[PDB]
Design a protein around this ligand. Structure first.
Ligand SMILES: CC(C)CCNC(=O)[C@H](CCC1CCCCC1)NC(=O)c1ccc(CNC(=O)c2cnn(-c3ccccc3)c2N)cc1
Length: 343
């Protein structure tokens, strides 16, 4: 066990290993309770997140377990990874705080698009990286579901990682959400995330939110204005009578020609957008397919777009007591094997 030191920061007690020095809060709460720190083992800046009331309820406890499991799994260049996880507790009995350590990222994409509209080259490279991380996540049967520009972090070298910062103690998730999981939430696949990548890529190209809806209905209306109302073939895959009635209640709208909307953009980018922003989720391009798209010719390397190890999601179906989820989380803290150092 390493030696821990104690301090207080912005309404909260941090007890961390001496390994981590010069803690300073970041984001004014925006990211959670998170400090930048210097990691003396590596000589690098890191981020240290203290989970908020991780075992307050069964729901918090399972969420805690879930986040730890997911972070321990992710081993890929374009996905946040886990550098360390610790608790000052010496036993399960005393276990009540969970701290996570990741790389410290430079800025989010929300900050970057709000600052400047990007070059077509920067768009190629950023979207390629998103898709490469998504091929990986999706290969483990993990769906992000919350993709938006504030959940993507980029450094000065333009290397990107996918994360999920979660709630706030503003960019609406709804603006980037697939129509199929806008009303019903039964019939959806991993390509909900590809819909979000299309919305993000549009905004990077244009500097404007593609579908800035006020609510779920308005959101749907903005969407169908671009992609058109569902034709007979998609209508007959909608089980929800109320959704089908709602859709069919609208004055029918044609699909726009995306070249008339994204006027002046690279045509290969326009063609990719058409393949991502398809209403029918069975017809939407997958991440693996998208990487082989001609828009990514300068980056795509089929020998360097790896899949994930399998991920055991079987816990998701379980209904357990708080002390059980806590003990499982403790197990995962104990079994953690830190990553290779040499960067
Ligand atoms: C509650 C619910 C909505 C989701 C909760 N979420 C999770 O479970 C995921 C778990 C892994 C996911 C990774 C992406 C793919 C899906 C799983 N969890 C994380 O992604 C996750 C967990 C911990 C951390 C800690 N790091 C930071 O906070 C951090 C790092 N850099 N910067 C930075 C960024 C830009 C500018 C300046 C500084 C930060 N602020 C970061 C992300």
């Amino acid at each position: 066990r390493p030696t821990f030191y104690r301090q207080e920061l912005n309404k909260t007690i941090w007890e961390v290993p001496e390994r981590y020095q010069n803690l300073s809060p970041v984001g004014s709460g925006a990211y959670g309770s998170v400090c930048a720190a210097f990691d003396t083992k590596t000589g690098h800046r890191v981020a240290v997140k203290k989970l908020s009331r991780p075992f307050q309820s069964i729901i918090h406890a399972k969420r805690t377990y879930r986040e730890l499991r997911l972070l321990k799994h992710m081993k890929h260049e374009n996905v946040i990874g886990l550098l360390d996880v610790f608790t000052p507790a010496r036993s399960l009995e005393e276990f009540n705080d969970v701290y996570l350590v990741t790389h410290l990222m430079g800025a989010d994409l929300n900050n970057i698009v709000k600052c400047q509209k990007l070059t077509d080259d920067h768009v190629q490279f950023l979207i390629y990286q998103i898709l490469r991380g998504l091929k990986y996540i999706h290969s483990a049967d993990i769906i992000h579901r919350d993709l938006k520009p504030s959940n993507l972090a980029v450094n000065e070298d333009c290397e990107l990682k996918i994360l999920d910062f979660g709630l706030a103690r503003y960019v609406a998730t709804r603006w980037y959400r697939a129509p199929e999981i806008m009303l019903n939430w039964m019939h959806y696949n991993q390509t909900v995330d590809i819909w979000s990548v299309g919305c993000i890529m549009a905004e990077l190209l244009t500097g404007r939110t593609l579908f800035p809806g006020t609510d779920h209905i308005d959101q749907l209306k903005l969407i169908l204005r671009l992609v058109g109302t569902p034709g007979a073939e998609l209508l007959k895959k909608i089980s929800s009578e109320s959704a089908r009635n709602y859709i069919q209640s609208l004055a029918q709208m044609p699909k726009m020609n995306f070249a008339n909307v994204f006027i002046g953009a690279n045509p290969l980018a326009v063609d990719l957008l058409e393949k991502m922003l398809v209403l029918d989720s069975d017809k939407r391009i997958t991440a693996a397919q998208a990487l082989a798209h001609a828009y990514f010719a300068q980056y795509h390397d089929p020998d360097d777009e790896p899949v994930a190890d399998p991920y055991d999601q079987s816990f998701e179906s379980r209904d357990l007591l708080i002390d059980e989820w806590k003990s499982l989380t403790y197990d995962e803290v104990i079994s953690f094997v830190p990553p290779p150092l040499d960067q």
